[PDB]
Amino acid sequence: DQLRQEAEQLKNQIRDARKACADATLSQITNNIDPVGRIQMRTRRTLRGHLAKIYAMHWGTDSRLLVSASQDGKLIIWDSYTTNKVHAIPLRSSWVMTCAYAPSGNYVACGGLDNICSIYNLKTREGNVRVSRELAGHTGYLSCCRFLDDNQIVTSSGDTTCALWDIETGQQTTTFTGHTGDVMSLSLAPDTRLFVSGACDASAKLWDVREGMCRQTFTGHESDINAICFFPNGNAFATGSDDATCRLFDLRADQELMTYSHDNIICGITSVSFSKSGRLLLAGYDDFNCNVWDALKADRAGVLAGHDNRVSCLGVTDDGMAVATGSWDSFLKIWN
Amino acid sequence: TLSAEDKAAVERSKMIDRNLREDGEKAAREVKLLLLGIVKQMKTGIVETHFTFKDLHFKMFDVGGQRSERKKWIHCFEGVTAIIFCVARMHESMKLFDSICNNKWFTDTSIILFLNAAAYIQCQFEDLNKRKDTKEIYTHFTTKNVQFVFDAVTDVIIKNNLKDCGL
């Protein structure tokens, strides 16, 4: 039983190293930096075609087409500019939790309580949309999934592990076990080489796709981590938890840099996203609102309030021109 | 103002909307019962059991085979017509019944209790719940089961429509 004692000693040593690496704080340096000011944006578009709660959305690469998944068993493609419907794919199972848009634009994916990930081909010769493949092997429900290429996809489940897939064969090529609780979040790096995941236990881990082992582990929260997002530069990320807190972790300092809390708001956090320049930090709360935080300074500057129910998803376009926000009242708005 | 292609795209969108409305109207006629806690003899996540009785489509969602934290996916079952709770040691069943009855998502969804000196335990079970005005508990000592489920669901749907109309 001395091995576990040595492991605890190693944990204490690495905590001491983390304390040693910290000499300054973000707030002290950013105090002199001028603030952003009050942020006011309005609902430019409102998309009304869903008859139930909306659980996921994802922007296309061109930042004009988007995809939405709801519990009526429907996955709808939206033309954002004119609020037109391009496709309406029906699903075999109506319990869905995730969306994904292929960077090429030819495929979409969805998963949920069915424990399988279904991939649909959008550009066929027959004029319809057909199920390209179904990926199975996870024991728990599917929480998130994101495309890498036309033939690679990473999924996360409640099995406390993540998986990489080969779509032309349908079999997993790598496994990223190591977590203790259910994995609820997922975020691919802009470089598409690194990978990050947060779990029900208050810990977030960094994975490498080509080797499949945990490079780094970050702690600091006290409840479930519900959302994670990657910084536009790939050297940091943001984690949003159930205890009304957001934290900014770094992949080189390997310690948290800043927290985003306020006594007025005490709820969960459902979605987290950044902006094009990294100065802004959107976040969706259970209290029917979406507070626009600030990255350099924790001061809250702006609120988006147009949803009757809580906001489940939150997306920001590639060119940073609009912010789409879906919610449980079966509508999704575009804010500019 | 609009091109011919734009007009055709708008017409396609209108057809999509019409099909969505028709599908919603179709799906609204079925009633969903969430099983929680062997009633499927007479008629890897969700195992939906489909049946029909007295010209009314019934979906039965058996979610007991999940082996994960219930607080993370139970909210997906908001809006279910009824929660069919099953009780056959009994202290654990009472504890989880109290947990599921006082959940924030289930403060307005009816619960049908199925059993598989009796007055004392029945009064205790119906007294475990706290809020008794707009929530009702239906008890049946286990042909007759499906008829009782039909009658209870009819009562719940009558009350729901009566409240929706504002009467």
Epitope: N84, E126, G127 | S3, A4, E11
Partner: single-chain antibody, 218 residues
């Protein structure tokens, strides 16, 4: 495989009605709008009639309006053209064309095999790399310009090359290119091997009376 086979036709005296039929197989017929396009033995293609998806919108040419009628049967996946009071001008070969309209689609994709019939507005110029010129600017306020290129090999039906002047159709080699400003459009071929010989047409899709060019031959 997608198949569009037209039937009917033949020899009919002037003033006698006729019915042309086209059967479609291998694709979702109810999601596509349909066109009839006729060509004279000595002239080029000429648009005839168009029926949208769901039969909720119909257009006819200004020279056959009133006499002709176009209809579709969706359960049987068939398209009908009823023609009355035929004259010597209607001696032409008729093709059936399919087209679907959403964001990013490619209309005028697949053309059928014509049937011979014998009885006994924006202007496009192809008087003369292939050149084409239009009377008015095809460019729209949303940034889309509508000019389509078709190639008809000898003894075969036309096939789509480039739609909206810039997007290459599926199954077409990357050698073909299209460019040009408003009212002046050009097509470029890198190297001219076999099977590239035929007649090239430029067509406009901006107002539903659709005008074809005179055509260019190599």
């Amino acid at each position: 495989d997608v198949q569009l086979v037209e039937s009917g036709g033949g020899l009919v005296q002037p003033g006698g009605s006729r019915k042309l039929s086209c059967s479609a197989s291998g694709f979702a017929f109810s999601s596509f709008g349909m066109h009839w396009v006729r060509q004279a033995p000595e002239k080029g293609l000429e648009w005839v009639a168009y029926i949208s998806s769901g039969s909720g919108t119909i257009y006819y040419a200004d020279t056959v309006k009133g006499r002709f009628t176009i209809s579709r049967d969706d359960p049987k996946n068939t398209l009908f053209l009823q023609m009355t009071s035929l004259r010597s001008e209607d001696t032409a070969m008729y093709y059936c064309v399919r087209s679907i309209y959403y964001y990013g689609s490619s209309p005028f994709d697949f053309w059928g095999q014509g049937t011979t019939l014998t009885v006994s507005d924006i202007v496009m110029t192809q008087a003369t790399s292939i050149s084409c010129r239009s009377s008015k600017s095809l460019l729209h306020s949303n940034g889309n310009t509508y000019l389509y290129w078709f190639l008809q090999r000898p003894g075969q039906s036309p096939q789509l090359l480039i739609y909206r002047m810039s997007n290459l159709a599926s199954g077409v080699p990357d050698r073909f290119s299209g460019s040009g400003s408003g009212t002046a459009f050009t097509l470029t071929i890198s190297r001219l091997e076999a099977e590239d010989v035929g007649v090239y047409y430029c067509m406009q899709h901006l107002e539903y009376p659709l005008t074809f060019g005179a055509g260019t031959k190599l």
